[PDB]
């Protein structure tokens, strides 16, 4: 029974256990962790079940939750599944990890859980409650269905805007230039359905995740140590008002969570 | 002539190329400079995914043209490997990763030489040139080291 978000461990102790080889790559990983350790004290290992990008981002977003974001507060959000599925029947090709009711229940849960965290009186109580939330398997995976649906919705908006000659974030031009992702239908069948199952997110889909939940995602990419990509931000130039969450990716294949002293369980 | 290749980080790579160079050539240059395997690379220009066998001229790419690099590498997968000692190690991997790449990672993490490594999944010895997906090794599968 893998833990969703493992208990925090001292970051250099974690590094030491994980990278023991006498090789340039191990040395690079250790140097990367050293630099991360200047700003973060601990690491929580995130479960690598192909939901990791969503789990890590959402855990960080919700565990820091001081307000319910307006986009999540909006009543219209609850009308979205019926609005979209009625309009685009191909959305019924959604693979679950009826449809309108199931997605709606997921979005309702996301809103309710996030609001419950935001309404707590102390940051400590919020952190503890968020930890417990990510030990309820069923509820947790429902949250990721909500997030995947928000990614699909945002992709539809950007696609339709782009097709009308309207201004769009540039990543969306690249997202839909991919041969397996030329339209929202292909994005769903070839990329999103696989999320949490047989495949995770590409870098261009990290942008889409950031826009879906309106959080800026800062990633320490240890493999890019000593280059300008060592700290990579999704999206590159985000709205100033989006909260920032930080992840670590050793070599672009999985995302764990770095933790500040002021974020510690103890 | 000079062309630019921009990543989804706005990092810009400058390449010296010729009009008759192919997209395959360009990916090879990107591998040389960035260490990115050609099979992970997509190059996009004017909203089109460029094909390996066509030339820059074929795509009207000229001096100062900017291509965009959009990688296929996905994040979010772990597998487990049990060593000859009995220790369990956790690797961060991609379904397209080769067995050879996995053995190299075991060396980086544990110091075990790839030449000494025999990996088993579902009774099968795994061949170096094949990918995790070729063997239907999924997230949180366990491989055995002998």
Author numbering:
A (entry chain A): 78 to 174, 183 to 351
B (entry chain B): 1 to 146
Mind quoting what the paper says about this structure?
Here, we reveal a previously unannotated human DUB, OTULIN (also known as FAM105B), which is exquisitely specific for Met1 linkages. FAM105B comprises 352 amino acids (aa), and the OTU domain spans the majority of the protein (aa 80–352) and an N-terminal region with predicted helical content. Having established FAM105B as a Met1-linkage-specific OTU DUB, we named the enzyme OTULIN (OTU DUB with linear linkage specificity). Crystal structures of the OTULIN catalytic domain in complex with diubiquitin reveal Met1-specific Ub-binding sites and a mechanism of substrate-assisted catalysis in which the proximal Ub activates the catalytic triad of the protease.
